[PDB]
């Protein structure tokens, strides 16, 4: 019942990001950038997935159902308060994009701040804090 | 006719004389009276700078006034109540009369 | 049970204090033994009144260490009730006896003092206090950054201290403190 | 951890000199005797003098006092 099964997977391959199959399903997903400890648990609850098992026992056909939940959050009834790009500037759809598109949708705002030469992008240009922090006392280890 | 009388005084012993005067003032007139309730006091903790400027060690003040309150109920008409409370009043104790 | 008392499920009596030098400072025999070692205090208000406190109580109060365990007495009383269970599951004897043999073998009889470092004799009440600090800390090292929990490290340290095999953390300074005072005298 | 100062000792001695006949041997017996014969400002000061009043009669019961 708990012995090593057949077709045991060491590392799974989803969205060009390593998933450690040695870990539990609810927390091995969180190693993927763009999904964390909260988003990985809910997508196991939006489908009939028993999260008491490990990531080396679930089938390769079932993870295809899992990844379509992240790729289509609104279509699979994921609440809108789990999405990282709510009310996007360009396309305007509320969605979660995983492990390659998150930085892909991060960076165009950075030259969008360069394209408007605003103060918010100037702190990224100078490599300083942007949320109104204080670098007089901190930020010492990263700067020489 | 269930008239309430409230006693608020800053001092401790000065309020004790007046409430005991009203104890004697109700028995001498022979009316049904509810006892003066020794109702808990409150202390106003004011802790500030002792120093005007910012030079010196950190000392904190300790200011405390303990206002104390009593309530006396009289089962008597209003004419008797105004007869007692209008005689020999001191600055320490305030008098409040409530009909109900 | 009004006539006799039961320490958990262990008996208070049938515990032998073999060393005549440590008879007065182990008050766990029918005078200060209690069912559970929780109390309010008042033992350390005076000088020698903490010696009348039982050594089981003194050991559980010596786990109250390093802040995050401070303010938590329901840790150590729950720990020591489980720590006495694991001791019986390996040796089989009364675990109150094991603690008595643990105190004797873990305290060095002879240490150094500052008057260059010079060596003089040490008091039996001094020895039981420093023995308790040495062996309670020994459980803390083996349970820190380790898979094993504190209740087994405390049990695994008390067993060997009743034998004296020089693997315990308290026994290690029992060799160290005695030997440095042997040369520095 | 207790020493009778000059204020306590001057109040206790003059009481014994003038009012010998009214004092007893137990602390509480002559404690209220000192209440009526002097004007004591506080509760604490009455008990402080009266202990040394009783402490001196144990010296008197031993023998003469200088």
């Amino acid at each position: 019942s708990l012995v090593i099964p057949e077709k045991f997977q060491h590392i799974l391959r989803v969205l060009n990001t390593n998933i450690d199959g040695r870990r539990k399903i609810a927390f091995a997903i969180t190693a993927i950038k763009g999904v964390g400890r909260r988003y990985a648990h809910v997508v196991l609850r939006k489908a009939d997935i028993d999260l008491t098992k490990r990531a080396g026992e679930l089938t390769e056909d079932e993870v295809e159902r899992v990844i379509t939940i992240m790729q289509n959050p609104r279509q699979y009834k994921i609440p809108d308060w789990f999405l990282n790009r709510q009310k996007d500037v360009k396309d305007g759809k509320y969605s979660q994009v995983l492990a390659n598109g998150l930085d892909n949708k991060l960076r165009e705002d950075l030259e969008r701040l360069k394209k408007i030469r605003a103060h918010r992008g100037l702190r990224h240009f100078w490599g300083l804090r942007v949320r109104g922090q204080h670098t007089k006392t901190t930020g010492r280890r990263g700067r020489t | 006719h269930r008239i309430r009388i409230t006693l608020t005084s800053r001092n401790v012993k000065s309020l004790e004389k007046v409430c005991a005067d009203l104890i004697r003032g109700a028995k001498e007139k022979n009316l049904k009276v509810k006892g003066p309730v020794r109702m808990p006091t409150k202390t106003l903790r004011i802790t500030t700078r002792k120093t005007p400027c910012g030079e010196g060690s950190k000392t904190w003040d300790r200011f405390q006034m303990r206002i104390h309150k009593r309530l006396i109920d009289l089962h008597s008409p209003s004419e008797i109540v105004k007869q007692i409370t209008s005689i020999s009043i001191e600055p320490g104790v305030e008098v409040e009369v409530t009909i109900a | 049970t009004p006539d006799i008392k039961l320490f958990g499920k262990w008996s208070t009596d049938d515990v032998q204090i073999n060393d005549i030098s440590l008879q007065d400072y182990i008050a766990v025999k029918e005078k200060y033994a209690k069912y559970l070692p929780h109390s309010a205090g008042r033992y350390a208000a005076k000088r020698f009144r903490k010696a009348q406190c039982p050594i089981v109580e003194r050991l559980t109060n010596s786990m109250m260490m390093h802040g995050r365990n401070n303010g938590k007495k329901l840790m150590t009383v729950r720990i020591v009730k489980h720590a006495f269970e694991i001791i019986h599951l390996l040796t089989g004897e009364n675990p109150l006896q094991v603690l008595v043999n643990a105190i004797i073998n873990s305290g060095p009889r002879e240490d150094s003092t500052r008057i260059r470092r010079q060596a003089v004799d040490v008091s039996p009440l001094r020895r039981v206090n420093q023995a308790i600090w040495l062996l309670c800390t020994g459980a803390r090292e083996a349970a820190f950054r380790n898979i094993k929990t504190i209740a087994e490290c405390l049990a695994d340290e008390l067993i060997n201290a009743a034998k004296g095999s020089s693997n315990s953390y308290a026994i290690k300074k029992k060799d160290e403190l005695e030997r440095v005072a042997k040369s520095n005298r | 951890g207790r020493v009778r100062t000059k204020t306590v000792k001057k109040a206790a001695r003059v009481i014994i000199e003038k009012y010998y006949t009214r004092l007893g041997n137990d602390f509480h017996t002559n404690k209220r005797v000192c209440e009526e014969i002097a004007i004591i400002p506080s509760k604490k000061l009455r008990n402080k003098i009266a202990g040394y009043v009783t402490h001196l009669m144990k010296r008197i019961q031993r023998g003469p006092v200088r």
């Binding site: 012995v3 099964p5 490990r54 | - | 489980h82 694991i86 599951l89 094993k148 087994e152 | -």
Partner: protein
């Protein structure tokens, strides 16, 4: 320097050591068993769940930080 490369499930060469040497072990805890087998501490707790279903080990005093189990009776 050192890394605890513990197992997540039980191999066939290690599952038989659970059925033979753990019955010869006097002390049954999820820490000593995990140390002597190089497995997860939580894995040893799941191994105790199947053994109590097997009815071979007896519990002494359970707690959330450490579960305690003992051997069968000698006679």
């Amino acid at each position: 320097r050192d890394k605890l490369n513990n197992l997540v499930l039980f191999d066939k060469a290690t599952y038989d050591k659970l059925c033979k040497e753990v019955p010869n072990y006097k002390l049954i805890t999820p820490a000593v068993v995990s140390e002597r087998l190089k497995i997860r501490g939580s894995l040893a707790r799941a191994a105790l769940q199947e053994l109590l279903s097997k009815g071979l080990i007896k519990l002494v005093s359970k707690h959330r930080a450490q579960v305690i189990y003992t051997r069968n009776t000698k006679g």
